[PDB]
Amino acid sequence: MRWENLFVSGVAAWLPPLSTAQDAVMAGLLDPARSKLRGIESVTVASDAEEDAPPRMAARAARAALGRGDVDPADVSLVLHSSLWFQGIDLWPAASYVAHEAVGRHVPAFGLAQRCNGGMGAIELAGAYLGSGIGAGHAALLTTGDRFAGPRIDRWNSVDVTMYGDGAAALVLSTRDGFARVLSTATGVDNSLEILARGDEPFAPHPVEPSPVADLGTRTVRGAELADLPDLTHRYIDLLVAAKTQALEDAGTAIEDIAHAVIPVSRRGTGHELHDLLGLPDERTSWAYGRTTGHVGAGDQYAGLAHLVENALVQPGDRVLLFGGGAGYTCTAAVVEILRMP
């Protein structure tokens, strides 16, 4: 999709303090070979206190993003809140809490689930909603938020390719103006890969209690066995290349013209990494930042953009690729252009 009138007006992250891989190694929680392989140096870790519940971190992130962009909360016509895991109270609309705390009473709020791609997928849904004339205002607030906890989640081991960080992020879209123009978005998808995110886990009538420790790497092995696909790996590559290709083409841009790619925090640690498939070096991606936070649920792309902007690592005229990816498997990519620094 080529966007004629879509802008990023604000972006921010609210992240708890860093907790080092070295401390996790010394405490016996993380094997040192895995620490070195995955290359994650630290992750963000929240306290157990109610004030660091995911909707609260999200509300804080949202207030900062709105504040950085001079978007009046009364101009927000939609709130989308993406997440991976428990929001702290069940049978309850988290997104309305985020919306109420950061925007107000009279804005429709949805919770969104597209695993790690949530943040990126929400751009397309919200952008479309803003262009439709359904809502009053010119802006949408997009949030992410998670806080991982035992026993179900072991942040250092429960997923093979990454390590989870706690926290929240926010991005404000506008059809009027902002510091960056959204030139394009594109989504690559291959829903056959969903089996890799459930492996042979049975469909249970109720959450299994007490929760065993999640091991998403292991689901992957039994998923691959069950799916029995000749081209399993190619299916991933093809959808990622589709997203990249269409987003760059719809932006009239080439990967050589991309100052920086903000990508999900994940690392194979040998062979080809995502930057190789994207066609740019490590140094032109957000890895140097993301390896200090870990995988902050659905928020890596928002957080990494905030990072670029806060540390004046881009200037007007630069183009940035925002690059998604989540179990499903779905990947939404966007090309933005820096118009001014906030």
The residue ranges that bind Cl ion (CB under 5 A) are 34, 214-215
Q: Between the CA of residue 261 and those of 56, 66, 201, 244, 257, what are the distances in Å? A: 29, 23, 35, 11, 11
Rounded to an integer, what is the distance from CA 281 to the centroid of its chain? Answer: 21
Cβ closest to Cl ion, residue 214 vs residue 331: 214
Amino acid code (one letter) for 127: G
Nearer to Cl ion, 113 or 125 (CB): 113
- Continuous segment of H or E residues that includes residue 11: strand 7-14
Q: Which residue type is seen at 24?
A: A
What's the closest the beta carbon of residue 81 comes to its own copies, in angstroms? Answer: 8
- The residue (of 214 and 261) whose beta carbon lies closer to Cl ion is 214
Looking at residue 306, the DSSP 8-state letter turns out to be H
Binding to its own copies in span 212-241, by CB under 8 A: 214, 216
- Separation between Cα atoms, residue 156 and residue 158, nearest integer Å: 6
| Residue window 196-215: x/- pattern of binding to its own copies, with contact defined by CB under 8 A | -xx--xxxxxxx-xxx--x-
296 binds its own copies (CB under 8 A): no
User: Which helix (H) or strand (E) element contains residue 6?
Assistant: none
Closest approach of its own copies to the CB of residue 288, in Å: 28
User: Which residue of this chain has its Cβ atom nearest to Cl ion in the complex?
Assistant: 34
Shortest spacing between CB 215 and Cl ion, in angstroms: 5
Residues 12 and 68 sit within 8 Å (Cβ to Cβ): yes
CB closer to its own copies, 155 vs 307:
155
Q: Minimum distance from CB of 244 to its own copies (Å)? A: 16
Q: Are 181 and 339 in contact (CB under 8 A)?
A: yes
Classify burial at 205, counting beta carbons within 10 Å of its beta carbon; exposed 0-12, middle 13-18, buried 19 or more. Answer: exposed
The rounded distance, in Å, linking the Cα atoms of 125 and 176 is 17
CB atoms within 10 A of CB 136: 11
Look at the chain and count its residues: 342
For position 177 contacting its own copies by CB under 8 A, the verdict is no
Q: Per CB under 8 A, which of residues 25..54 are in contact with its own copies?
A: 48, 50, 53
Binding letters toward its own copies, positions 82-121, x by CB under 8 A: --xxx-xxxxxxxxxx-xx---xxxxxxxxxxxx--x--x
Nearer to its own copies, 45 or 308 (CB): 45
Sites for its own copies among residues 126-155 (CB under 8 A): 127-129, 131-134, 147, 149-152
Residue 34 binds which one of its own copies, Cl ion, none, with CB within 5 to 8 A depending on kind?
Cl ion
Rank residues 306 and 328 by Cβ distance to its own copies and give the closer one: 328
Q: Please, what is the minimum distance in Å from the beta carbon of residue 219 to its own copies?
A: 8
User: Rounded to an integer, what distance in angstroms lies between the CA atom of residue 73 and that of residue 161?
Assistant: 37
Q: In angstroms, what is the minimal distance from the CB of 93 to its own copies?
A: 4
